[PDB]
Enzyme design. Sequence first.
Site, PDB file in Angstrom:
ATOM      1  N   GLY A 125     -10.630   0.911   6.385  1.00 40.49           N
ATOM      2  CA  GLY A 125     -10.587  -0.021   5.272  1.00 40.49           C
ATOM      3  C   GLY A 125      -9.742   0.553   4.162  1.00 40.49           C
TER       4      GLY A 125
ATOM      5  N   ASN B  69      -8.153   0.273  -3.941  1.00 42.42           N
ATOM      6  CA  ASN B  69      -7.158   0.761  -4.889  1.00 42.42           C
ATOM      7  C   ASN B  69      -7.110   2.292  -4.922  1.00 42.42           C
ATOM      8  OD1 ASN B  69      -5.318  -0.894  -6.635  1.00 42.42           O
ATOM      9  ND2 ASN B  69      -5.979   0.613  -8.183  1.00 42.42           N
TER      10      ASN B  69
ATOM     11  N   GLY C 296      -7.522   4.448  -2.541  1.00 34.00           N
ATOM     12  CA  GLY C 296      -6.931   5.075  -1.371  1.00 34.00           C
ATOM     13  C   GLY C 296      -7.552   4.486  -0.122  1.00 34.00           C
TER      14      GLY C 296
ATOM     15  N   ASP D 290     -20.783  -4.027  -9.302  1.00 30.51           N
ATOM     16  CA  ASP D 290     -19.817  -4.524  -8.314  1.00 30.51           C
ATOM     17  C   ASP D 290     -20.551  -5.016  -7.083  1.00 30.51           C
ATOM     18  OD1 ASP D 290     -17.283  -5.172  -7.290  1.00 30.51           O
ATOM     19  OD2 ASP D 290     -16.822  -3.127  -6.665  1.00 30.51           O
TER      20      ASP D 290
END
Length: 269
Positions: free
Chosen positions: A16, A19, A21, A127
């Site tokens: 996967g 942002n 890495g 989040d």
Amino acid sequence: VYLDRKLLTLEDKELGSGNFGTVKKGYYQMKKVVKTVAVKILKPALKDELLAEANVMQQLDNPYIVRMIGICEAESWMLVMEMAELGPLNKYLQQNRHVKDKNIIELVHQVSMGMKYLEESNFVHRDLAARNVLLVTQHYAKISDFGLSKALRADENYYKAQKWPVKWYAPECINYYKFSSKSDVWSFGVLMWEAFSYGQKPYRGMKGSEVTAMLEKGERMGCPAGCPREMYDLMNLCWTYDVENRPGFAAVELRLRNYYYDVVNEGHH
Ligand SMILES: Cc1cccc(Nc2nc(N[C@@H]3CCCC[C@@H]3N)ncc2C(N)=O)c1
């Protein structure tokens, strides 16, 4: 907390991306067994974000929250966690569209138990989305991805902020930059919708500022196909505009627990 690079074997393929890495699969030689791991691998702000995230996960001890193994400084900074083999919930439901309704209720209840714990622990997630729910099996889900997470101050019920997953955010976050457990309850509503829509993105084809406009008018996303009514009632409850009157996770988990018991009873009948 600090791991030995020599004991870590990375794999080439990347599982996967974010942002920060990459996420890659690996192995860590524990005391006698080898343990399968997922590693977050960075590509100065980013560095500090990984250390904070690791410091948050270190404090968390629950069956429904991903466990951090430790961290490592080699090629780059690496955050090493136990591996959730079946991956992010949203992708999985996109590729397995016949997952039964009882199974979805099961998985979102597990997220709710992990969120009740997180509330009791006075951490906000900030989040909370289906892409950040990770599946160990088809009947075992865990919350991860704590990069926006905050430990609340002993004297506050919220954290005051200073790029955001806007479509998962409560009105008070957008308008006042204030994130609390009730704010994560709002995102859980969106998460449920995502789960019952089998991994579809919420508020599709709308920009962030249009969503805000929609919610203020008192509009909410419609019931997903085949979603039980009471689960949609719970979604709408999570979407209580006013923080004061929105339920906390204790109420949400209790409600999900009980509804799941009716559905398990139904199946046997
Ligand atoms: C098969 C597969 C594919 C992608 C990621 C994973 N595993 C994880 N991904 C994330 N973070 C990801 C970051 C990129 C977007 C999806 C996820 N939120 N965190 C933790 C894990 C973990 N403990 O296993 C597994």
